[PDB]
């Protein structure tokens, strides 16, 4: 069965977060590792994989380490030709090196024809009303929930100021994936309470490498505002 939906005390509140909200913004605002048709070159811990991947733009890294939930997942992908998409960090990253979690899909067999892109509808609720809906895209048949989440958050940062440097216009926020077998799961879009944001611990949720069928999955973002 599904992860049950958030109960009230399940969700992080931005007002109980007194660190820097730019640290969350930074992770999703035009920020991702993406590499295409790659094979792992190395390992640090038993559950991760290192890839030779350069950032086209700001030439910040040329090796990426992705950590996975378990050793079996690292074994499974070790020698496969894969596509990689995820959110990267430098704070507490050790192995121009950069770190992430999950983000791996096999290359072969995993694309639509004719260079087709698949649109995935994201419906945004604010205080339980459907205010906007937009579409994110992927060329991948089986896509990581991480990658879809990243795309949807990037759009929301720009359109709805989901995150700013100081804090957020929003108190709570979660993203919900509905699979066509009935399976649902969700991620808290807000930082853990306190004065520091731990990026590595935040992104750690993506280490399950959870993938969804792009063509049938639904996405709901549910946000609440500050007062009422
Ligand atoms: Zn591919």
Curated annotation (Swiss-Prot):
GO-annotated molecular function: metal ion binding; toxin activity
Disulfide pattern: 93-99
Subcellular location: Secreted
Coiled-coil positions: none
Keywords: Disulfide bond, Enterotoxin, Metal-binding, Secreted, Signal, Superantigen, Toxin, Virulence, Zinc
One GO CC annotation: extracellular region
Pfam families: Stap_Strp_tox_C (PF02876), Stap_Strp_toxin (PF01123)
Residues noted as binding Zn(2+) in the record, renumbered to the chain: 9, 83, 107, 111
SUPFAM superfamilies in UniProt: Bacterial enterotoxins (SSF50203), Superantigen toxins, C-terminal domain (SSF54334)
Source species, domain of life: Bacteria
Family: Belongs to the staphylococcal/streptococcal toxin family.
Biological function: Staphylococcal enterotoxin that activates the host immune system by binding as unprocessed molecules to major histocompatibility (MHC) complex class II and T-cell receptor (TCR) molecules. In turn, this ternary complex activates a large number of T-lymphocytes initiating a systemic release of pro-inflammatory cytokines. Also causes the intoxication staphylococcal food poisoning syndrome.
Subunit structure: Interacts with MHC class II molecules composed of alpha/HLA-DRA and beta/HLA-DRB1 chains. Interacts with host T-cell receptor/TCR beta variable chain TRBV8-2.
Protein name: Enterotoxin type C-3
Organism: Staphylococcus aureus
Gene, per the UniProt record: entC3
